[model samples]
Target: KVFERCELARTLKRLGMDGYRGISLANWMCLAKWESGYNTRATNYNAGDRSTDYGIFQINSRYWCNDGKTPGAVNAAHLSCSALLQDNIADAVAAAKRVVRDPQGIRAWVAWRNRCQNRDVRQYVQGCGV
Candidate 1:
């Protein structure tokens, strides 16, 4: 599922992500843009490690979700990767919270590191009308 920027912002706010878990809502929006462009079913396969990133937050199959094709998947979210691909975003938000609580915090997302870290991404939600 694809979402408009404001729609995602409103949804994220409703999900209590407005500065939740030490991350600003603006940074989260920036992360979403760089990671998946607000598409729920986004997937990126990394041939180097034979791993795949799933969903809007780009949770990794290596440590966060199971790809099914690969045995012994770590699956930290304790849910199927397919769950993150759904349009509802409930499961995806839960999984993202879990990742953020980890030692790396929001740094769990490389997109955050490369694009959102130390940057004022407030413009991402400027016209959301929230």
Candidate 2:
């Protein structure tokens, strides 16, 4: 999870978004807890169905893909953790920024967490108003 965390943080920064740097660390951390429990190499298998939603943030391979490939598509097993660690978290944070604005830290992330529950992430893309 260490390397993945760094790579993911880098991605979020490059996306022209903030709040994930330190203010929103808890957000992703909690999401990691709730979604996959910090299992950077985890996968649901057999009775559960093995898949690529691995790593700290549990980033589904599909979502992590830039535009064409899935998360870890370059090397799903090797870099899957780093793949999950990419900047999409910033995209998620950016989604909250558009809806709720505050000079303080992210109470909005709390709001976005609830708002995003079970919903398609594409709905949260830049300027996709709810």
Candidate 3:
């Protein structure tokens, strides 16, 4: 599922993404934008580690979900990696929450570090009317 920008913004806010773990909704927006362009089915494989990143936020199989491709990967979120690719985003959102609970918080995503950090993140939520 490819989500419209505002559609995803509002949906994520309703899912309690706003101020989640001290991370702004706009920050999450930026992550989704760069990670998967709001497409729930987006996936990227990491051949070196035999893992894959799945869904809108690019939650990875290495530590978050299990797709059986990575030797040491574990389903810490307790769901299949396939769940992250579904049109419905509830499961993916849950996994995202779990990831941020780590010490690094939203900084866990490299996309955020390079593209979103210390930027004009307000642009992400400006037109959403949230």
Query: Model 2, range 24-115, lDDT digits (tens) per residue?
Result: 43354345445554444445322333335444444444423232334334422223344444434443334333323445433333433674
Which stretches in model 2 have alpha-carbon errors above 4 Å?
1-18, 21-23, 45-51, 66-130
- Candidates 1 and 2 compared by TM-score, better number: 1
Each model's Cα RMSD: 1.3, 12.2, 0.7
TM-score of 1: 0.93
TM-score, candidate 3, is 0.98
Better of 2 and 3 by TM-score: 3
| Candidate 3 overall lDDT versus native | 0.94
Clashes of 2: 4
Q: Relative to the unseen true structure, what is the C-alpha lDDT of residue 57 in candidate 1, on a scale of 0 to 100?
A: 91
Ranking by TM-score: 3, 1, 2
Which candidate, 1 or 2, has the higher lDDT?
Answer: 1
Worst 10 residues of 1 by lDDT: 64-73
Please say which candidate is ahead in TM-score: 1 or 3. 3
* Clashes per candidate (backbone, < 3 Å): 0, 4, 0
